[PDB]
Design a protein. Sequence first.
Lengths: 272, 58, 410
Amino acid sequence: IHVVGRCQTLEKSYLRLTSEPNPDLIRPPNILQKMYCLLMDKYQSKTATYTYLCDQFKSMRQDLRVQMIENSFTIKVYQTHARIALENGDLGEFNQCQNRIMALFENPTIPKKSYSEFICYSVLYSMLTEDYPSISHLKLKLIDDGSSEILEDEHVKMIFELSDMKLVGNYHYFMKNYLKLHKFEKCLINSFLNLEKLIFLTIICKSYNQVNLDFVKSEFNFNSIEETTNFLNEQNLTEFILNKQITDSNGKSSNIKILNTKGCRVQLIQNY
Amino acid sequence: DDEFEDFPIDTWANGETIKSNAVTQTNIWEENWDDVEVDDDFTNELKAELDRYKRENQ
Amino acid sequence: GCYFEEKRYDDKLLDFIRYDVKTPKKTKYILQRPTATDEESVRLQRFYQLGVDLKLKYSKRRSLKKQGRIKNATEELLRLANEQLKLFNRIVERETNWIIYPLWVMAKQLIRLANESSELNKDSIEECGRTIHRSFTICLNDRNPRLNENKKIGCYMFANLEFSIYHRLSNKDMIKNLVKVLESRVNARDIPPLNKSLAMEHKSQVVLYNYYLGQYYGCLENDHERGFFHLNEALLQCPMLYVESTGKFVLQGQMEKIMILLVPLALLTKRLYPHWDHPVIAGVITRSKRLSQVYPTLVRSVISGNLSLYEATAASHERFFLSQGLHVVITLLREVVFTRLVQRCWQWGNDRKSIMPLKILLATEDEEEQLDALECRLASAIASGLLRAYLSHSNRCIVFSKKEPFPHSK
């Protein structure tokens, strides 16, 4: 028999449960649902700290785990904390939620709302953890599950394709496919995008002897050339940004900014 | 699923291994990777479309 | 009971140890000289009673007579075998190395004991894994420097038992521990190498250990160079012996699933591809429906630089490659194919001139975009060591090295 709770106060703070549960402090789902709305209000109006929302969500999550509620409301709470966690950089609570969501999708009684969205988060997190077996074991699961509607969704295909593009260092389409990502997908990529930019920058610098600064700027989706040079200054490469004047046909001239990528080679191989 | 851990024969002599018979048997791995040309429809048409390029770019 | 007194083992002992296979009508199944009060002598005597009971169960195990569930009776057999093997561990912990292969045959059939059960909600595998972990440990740390009783020569045989258990349900953390600990141990010479281990006495475990290592290295930790090595060595130690009845290699199955990983791993690391006529490749590739066309076509597209054929071969058998743990290998091996095409436009389209226009490769901002994408794919190959060249965005060309332009390890 599952433990049932009757706490009528909407708020509750997280504590790792050491005792056998106290029904007087565990909230029933109707009260957990009334506080979901208040939390959502606060998040939407941005009148609360993420620390505060995360505490309230973990307590909401804890009250569901002791009461054995695995239904559509449960999926809603975990999907909502997962999303908010990604928005604030809390990859640890995202991953706690993501694992539980996937396990709750194994239940046939629970409808698979936003299955493809969280399939995408699973691929993107495995890209961050450098966990390619997981990506492949999940593609194989979808195939053996008969989930062809999900697999031929253009967005899902792109996300799996992105994991392959990182694997073989295709900076050109990976950065070009960064603009196709949904709101929280961008938040997840940002956890490892600096290192990925550095990995892409090494590849460029091992392969050319010099490139335009604009060409570097375009390929890395820098909104302006100032954040382009800040990114090189973050790698101790500012002195390799040289200036060379140009007269292609001896009829007009101008000066362009060059990056001596051959000079950058000596610097960037020291760090990896 | 299917057990491949259960071998049909538990042991054999060393003289009966490919490695030990490998002075009797030639290399299983062909090593002409740099110099092997193969002739098939694809290769033949690859030279075709490239001979065309050399003719227009003389 | 002279095996335990005078520290030797025979087939009769192994046949007594074999509980799955029933014994003939005349039985010699008995212990000897029973008037002992030593605690450790009753460990042997309790072991003897556990053994006779285990053997008897199989006679009644087949005779369910449609009773219904036997999961409890199966669980009876399992703790029968587990407190028996945990007791053999109590015996083998401080005995000489005579008694390690009897420990292993016991262990290996307790794996097939939990192998028959198909339900992992009630899996009793934990008992086995712990029991075998101790068995691996009892040999792994032997404090006797003299080798008469050293049990660290069976260290690798027992690792294959754990590999087998760790692969049952996908656990790539647990396999990873075992590879990394063992590597260190022989490098410090705490255990002897596999070629001078107890695995040479039973060479089935020789091939298996190189498989588990090479598979882990190639499919899980993405170390292809080492993955190729151990898988290749696993095939080089397979017996050239055939079954009389069909004339096919005795280990046809073992050889083929090694070959599934070995062939594409061999092309990626070292640019090696098989001799199809050669007895060993031909004996396996041609007699396996799965590999009979896929792999000749797969090798062909790489050698020839045929990108579409490779992509079609990978698209058509993606389920197969995914289930074999070959996705990264396939995905990385496709860029070898792209590099060979690049080599072919060098040989035949630019006259081996180290300066090559990028528009050559277009014949095989639409055009500006295709060239940007082409620079980037060449840049990644340059940066990975498939091309020794450098790019020029300005003239939209590539500049091959004057020496070693298309390197590959050998």
